[PDB]
C-alpha cells in the first residue's frame, strides 16, 4: 500500500518523551519493548530516573529492567488470533513511514473480529486502541466529527511522537553512531593523506 | 445499528435498575451509560440466550427483538458513564495491577484491551470499565475467575486473566476502576 512519509527527528527529546508516554500508556498493555531497559530510555530521552519510574514504569519493575509486560505472547496469540510482536525493533522491521501510515490507517470494519481493519495492514489483529484519540475513522479514510479527543493534526503529532520513540527504540545508538562516525571518518581521511604520501614517496 | 432516540423509550424499563441514563445508583447494578454498543448488545444477547446468567434479568429481554436490543444498546452507548471514587487504601495496588498487570505471574495489564483510561474499545467489544461500580466489577472478576461467567468466548480471555487475580487484587483493582476515568 501507499505509505505516508514522516520526518522523524531523533534529537527531539520532547517528542520522544511524548512518544514514550504514549507507548507506555496505550501500547505496553499488549506489546513488550523487552529488548530495551527503562534506564536507557530515560537516559537517552533526558528523563530523570525518578520521573521515569513514576511516570512510565507501571509494571513494578526496576529502572534497569527490560520493558516487559504481563501479557504473555501465547495468551495474546490465543486472544487476538495473533501475537502482538515486541515493538523494540518494529521501527527497523517496518520502517517509520510504515508505522506512521499503519497507526493512522485503522478504520471501522464490522466484518472483522475487532470491528476494525487497516489500510496498511489488511485483516490485522490489532484492535484500534487509539480510537479514543483519533476518533471514529471510516472509509478514503475520514474521521467522524466529534468522536475523538484529538483532531487530525493533533493525532498526527501524537502518532509522529510515538513513531519517533519507536525509531529511537529500534536504533538507540544512531546519534552516538553519527557522532563517533564523524570522528572516525575524519581520522581515516587524515591517515589516508599520510598513507597516500608514503606510497607516493616509495613508488618513485 | 440501533437508534438511540427509540432506545431511550425502549430502555425506560431498564432504568429501574440501571438508572434512566444508564448510571445505576446501586453498586450491584452495572452502569450501562457510555458502555460500548457492541459489548452492550453482546451482553444483551448472551443474557437472552442464557450464555450469561442474570437472575434479576430473567425474562426481561425475551420479548425484545434484535432491533429493540440494538436501540437500547445504542441509547446507553450515547450516554456518559459517571465516575466514582477509589478507596485511598486500595488505589495504589489497584492502579499497579490495572496499569502493569503481573510480570511474574504473566497476568496482562488491563490498559491494553481496556483503554488506559478504562473507556474500553467500543469497536472490538472490550467493555468500558472506568467509573463502573467497584462492587459490580469485583463480582464480574470473581465470576470470571470462578468460571461462573463464561460468555467471554472460547478464548476464555477474561476467565484466564481473572484466574490470576486474588481476592485482594480483585478488591483493589475494582476500587481503582471505580475511581478511574
Amino acid at each position: 500500500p501507499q505509505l505516508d512519509h514522516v520526518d522523524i527527528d531523533l534529537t527531539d527529546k520532547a517528542a520522544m518523551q511524548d512518544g514514550a508516554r504514549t507507548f507506555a500508556n496505550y501500547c505496553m498493555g499488549c506489546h513488550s519493548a523487552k529488548f530495551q531497559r527503562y534506564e536507557r530510555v530515560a537516559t537517552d530521552l533526558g528523563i530523570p530516573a525518578d520521573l521515569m519510574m513514576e511516570k512510565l514504569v507501571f509494571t513494578g519493575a526496576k529502572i534497569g529492567d527490560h520493558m516487559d509486560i504481563g501479557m504473555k505472547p501465547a495468551d495474546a496469540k490465543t486472544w487476538f488470533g495473533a501475537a502482538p510482536p515486541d515493538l523494540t525493533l518494529v521501527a527497523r522491521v517496518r520502517g517509520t513511514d510504515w508505522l506512521y501510515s499503519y497507526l493512522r490507517s485503522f478504520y471501522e470494519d464490522p466484518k472483522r473480529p475487532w470491528g476494525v481493519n487497516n489500510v496498511i495492514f489488511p485483516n490485522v489483529g490489532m484492535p484500534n486502541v487509539l480510537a479514543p484519540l483519533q476518533g471514529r475513522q471510516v472509509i478514503q479514510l475520514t474521521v467522524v466529527p466529534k468522536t475523538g479527543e484529538l483532531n487530525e493534526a493533533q493525532f498526527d503529532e501524537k502518532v509522529k511522537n510515538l513513531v519517533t520513540f519507536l525509531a529511537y527504540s529500534a536504533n538507540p545508538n544512531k546519534l552516538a553512531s553519527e557522532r563517533i562516525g564523524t570522528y572516525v571518518l575524519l581520522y581515516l581521511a587524515f591517515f589516508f593523506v599520510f598513507a597516500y604520501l608514503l606510497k607516493r614517496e616509495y613508488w618513485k | 445499528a440501533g437508534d438511540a432516540a427509540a432506545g431511550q423509550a425502549k430502555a425506560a424499563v431498564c432504568g429501574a435498575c440501571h438508572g434512566a441514563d444508564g448510571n445505576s445508583p446501586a453498586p450491584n447494578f452495572p452502569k450501562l451509560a457510555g458502555q460500548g454498543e457492541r459489548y452492550l448488545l453482546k451482553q444483551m444477547h448472551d443474557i437472552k440466550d442464557g450464555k450469561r446468567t442474570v437472575l434479576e434479568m430473567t425474562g426481561l429481554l425475551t420479548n425484545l427483538s434484535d432491533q429493540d436490543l440494538a436501540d437500547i444498546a445504542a441509547y446507553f452507548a450515547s450516554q456518559k458513564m459517571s465516575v466514582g471514587m477509589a478507596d485511598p487504601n486500595l488505589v495504589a495496588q489497584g492502579e499497579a495491577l490495572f496499569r502493569g498487570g503481573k510480570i511474574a505471574e504473566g497476568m496482562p495489564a488491563c490498559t491494553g484491551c481496556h483503554s488506559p483510561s478504562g473507556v474500553g474499545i467500543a469497536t472490538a467489544g472490550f467493555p468500558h470499565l472506568g467509573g463502573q461500580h467497584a462492587t459490580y466489577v469485583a463480582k464480574q472478576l470473581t465470576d470470571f475467575r470462578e468460571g461462573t461467567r463464561t460468555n467471554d468466548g472460547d478464548t476464555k480471555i477474561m476467565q484466564s486473566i481473572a484466574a490470576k487475580l486474588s481476592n485482594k487484587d480483585i478488591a483493589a483493582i475494582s476500587s481503582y476502576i471505580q475511581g478511574l476515568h
Partner: peptide, 16 residues
C-alpha cells in the same frame, strides 16, 4: 515540563 509531558493517561478519583 517533562513531568507534564509524561503524565499517565489513566486518571483515578480517590475519596478525600
Amino acid at each position: 515540563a517533562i513531568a507534564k509531558r509524561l503524565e499517565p493517561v489513566g486518571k483515578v478519583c480517590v475519596q478525600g
